Design a protein around this nucleic acid. Structure first.
Ligand SMILES: COc1cc2[nH]c(C(=O)N3C[C@@H](Cn4cnc(N)c5ncnc4-5)c4c3cc(O)c3[nH]c(C(=O)N5CCc6c5c(O)c(OC)c5[nH]c(C(=O)SC)cc65)cc43)cc2cc1O
Ligand SMILES: [Ca+2]
Length: 227
DNA sequence: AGGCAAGC
DNA sequence: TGCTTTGCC
């Protein structure tokens, strides 16, 4: 049972605003891996805002406590809310929190939580601490955990001109022979996105290095008409 | 406001 | 495959 007063307040307020008619299709969309209360993103964020306006944002010493307690609640909106909360503490998040973020990635894993952790929170940490990438990314690739592998692929997704091209291509080469949908698809996504910034090097990469056909097709869907 | 981004 | 609905930017 959650014990932090902020989490208890949030749980009560979310539960009081549940919508069972939305809960069923929301849970089906995530392959019924999770129960849902039936609260979509606009309403979920406003309910969190209500609780912050009443109680104020808890002290930064508590932010991991709060996120952990929310992660253990059954309904999926509590994990989505915990990530909204983590965004409000981002000035206090640094390299010492990478293991905490790893834990969140591999606990109650699915594409919604993992994608909300990786390009923003890990992306920002490794921009400030790029000399720490080698302590994590190769480990994640070798772990055979598909969500840490997707993290290795997508932490640079929002980098645009900051992208470390040789690193991106090494990561992708290490994972290109994965059978896994969420890995093949992440490779396609990150290549398509980076092609918005540096289309010529993505084209050269895709024409000279092996990729699953899903990955290759997705990578080039916007630039192929230029060649 | 609208374009671009899993499910089946 | 290319349409769905909702979410991110
Ligand atoms: C950094 O850069 C980016 C990060 C990004 N994150 C997301 C994202 O996180 N997405 C996009 C979008 C999921 N999504 C939707 N449409 C598409 N066409 C998509 N293509 C891919 N994903 C897609 C989505 C999430 C996350 C979620 O946690 C989501 N949850 C739902 C959802 O819950 N859905 C979608 C389908 C659906 C619901 C839902 O609530 C419902 O509740 C009623 C639904 N009812 C029905 C029906 O009765 S139809 C017969 C369908 C239905 C959508 C959804 C997009 C995105 C974009 C970026 O550039
Ligand atoms: Ca698609």
């Amino acid at each position: 049972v959650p014990m932090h007063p902020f989490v208890k307040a949030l749980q009560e307020h979310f539960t009081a605003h549940q919508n069972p008619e939305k809960a069923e299709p929301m849970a089906r969309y995530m392959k019924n891996h999770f129960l849902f209360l039936g609260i979509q993103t606009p309403e979920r964020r406003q309910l969190l805002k209500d609780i912050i306006q009443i109680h104020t944002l808890p002290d930064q010493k508590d932010f991991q406590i709060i996120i952990r307690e929310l992660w253990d609640l059954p309904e999926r909106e509590f994990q989505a809310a915990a990530l909204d909360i983590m965004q409000k503490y981002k000035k206090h998040i640094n390299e010492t929190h990478i293991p905490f973020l790893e834990e969140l990635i591999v606990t109650k894993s699915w594409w919604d939580s993992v994608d909300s952790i990786v390009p923003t929170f890990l992306g920002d940490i490794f921009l400030k601490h790029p000399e720490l990438i080698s302590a994590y990314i190769p480990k994640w690739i070798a772990s055979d955990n598909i969500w840490l592998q997707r993290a290795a692929i997508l932490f640079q997704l929002k980098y645009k001109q900051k992208m470390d091209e040789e690193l991106l291509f090494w990561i992708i080469g290490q994972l290109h022979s994965s059978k896994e949908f969420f890995i093949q698809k992440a490779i396609g996504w990150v290549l398509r996105e980076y092609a918005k910034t540096n289309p010529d090097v993505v084209w050269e990469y895709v024409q000279n290095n092996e990729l699953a056909p899903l990955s290759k097709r997705e990578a080039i869907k916007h630039i192929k008409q230029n060649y």
